[PDB]
Design a protein around this ligand. Structure first.
Ligand SMILES: Oc1cc(O)c2c(c1)O[C@H](c1cc(O)c(O)c(O)c1)[C@H](O)C2
Length: 121
């Protein structure tokens, strides 16, 4: 699913404020992470990143490329490619708990200013 900006804003409600990250910050960060494509996959021969949040199969979820992933989120990476972001968000919270927002390199570069582009009524 190719989400719109304010569909992301709505669907990410449960991340608002968690770990100090605002919802406009998440709307910006996801745009510059996956372009709002819930089916985005970025890969090389070592690792694969999945979905709206580009969660990786090195340590966060398990897949066929890396079946021995630590799988901290205790989930198949395939669950990050569907339209339901509930499990996505649960995993994002674990990422924030352990390594914080700089898992998403777009946040510092692109989403620490001009947050008024990322607002929804
Ligand atoms: O969390 C809420 C929940 C949703 O039901 C609404 C969401 C945000 O914003 C949308 C929206 C669309 C636009 O085209 C805008 O320009 C805008 O500001 C907001 C629209 O109101 C539906």
């Amino acid at each position: 699913e190719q989400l719109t900006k304010c569909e992301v804003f709505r669907e990410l409600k449960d991340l608002k404020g968690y770990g100090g990250v605002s919802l406009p910050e998440w709307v910006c960060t996801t745009f510059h992470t996956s372009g709002y494509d819930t089916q985005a996959i970025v890969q090389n021969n070592d690792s694969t990143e999945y979905g709206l949040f580009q969660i990786n199969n090195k340590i966060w979820c398990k897949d066929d490329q890396n079946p021995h992933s630590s799988n901290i989120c205790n989930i198949s990476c395939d669950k990050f490619l569907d339209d339901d972001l509930t499990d996505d968000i649960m995993c994002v919270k674990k990422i924030l708990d352990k390594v914080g927002i700089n898992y998403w390199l777009a946040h510092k570069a692109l989403c620490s200013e001009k947050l008024d582009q990322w607002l929804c009524e």
